[PDB]
Amino acid sequence: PKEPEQLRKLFIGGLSFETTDESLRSHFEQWGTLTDCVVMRDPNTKRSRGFGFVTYATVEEVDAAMNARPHKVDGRVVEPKRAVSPGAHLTVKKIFVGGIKEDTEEHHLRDYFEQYGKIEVIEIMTDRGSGKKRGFAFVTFDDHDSVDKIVIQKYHTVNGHNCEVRKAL
Numbered sequence: 001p002k003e004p005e006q007l008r009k010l011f012i013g014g015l016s017f018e019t020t021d022e023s024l025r026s027h028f029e030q031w032g033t034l035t036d037c038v039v040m041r042d043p044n045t046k047r048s049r050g051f052g053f054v055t056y057a058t059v060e061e062v063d064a065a066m067n068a069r070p071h072k073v074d075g076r077v078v079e080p081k082r083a084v085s086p087g088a089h090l091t092v093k094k095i096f097v098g099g100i101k102e103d104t105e106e107h108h109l110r111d112y113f114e115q116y117g118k119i120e121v122i123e124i125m126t127d128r129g130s131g132k133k134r135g136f137a138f139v140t141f142d143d144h145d146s147v148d149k150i151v152i153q154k155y156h157t158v159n160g161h162n163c164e165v166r167k168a169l
């Protein structure tokens, strides 16, 4: 029962124009089995478009590749990104966490979310007038991949609450 292919892909931006299917594959195979690996090229000139994609056999392999950033491929530092649910990636480092009610504290959010990435800010939202907890929070990470992993999960359970988590701008 394989994970959906969409969740096993990495977009690789910023390629050297001299990177090929073969050199991209040789590089990224260090972190897992690649079922697909392609450099996007112009249909007439064959000149590289400067980006490509690799598809791993498993999500854990995608994680391994992302944890090995920065990647220098054929002499240039590239920009890998995983897919999240217009074809444009909203690359952000902050999430909204809703449904946490009044009993959820910072350590609850930290203990859970720290396994997705390095946390820089936790903001538990309180009422401007009364100071009472409003039942939602924002978490800011040091890097976008944490957020990307978070928002593709179907479920998040924090402090016994089923939470709604979205990218925050």
Ligand SMILES: CN1CCN(c2ncccc2F)CC1=O
Binding pocket: 010, 011, 013, 051, 081, 082, 083, 084, 087, 088, 089
């Ligand atoms: C995760 N991700 C982000 C980047 N991405 C792109 N695709 C095609 C062209 C340019 C792009 F930035 C789509 C995708 O798979």
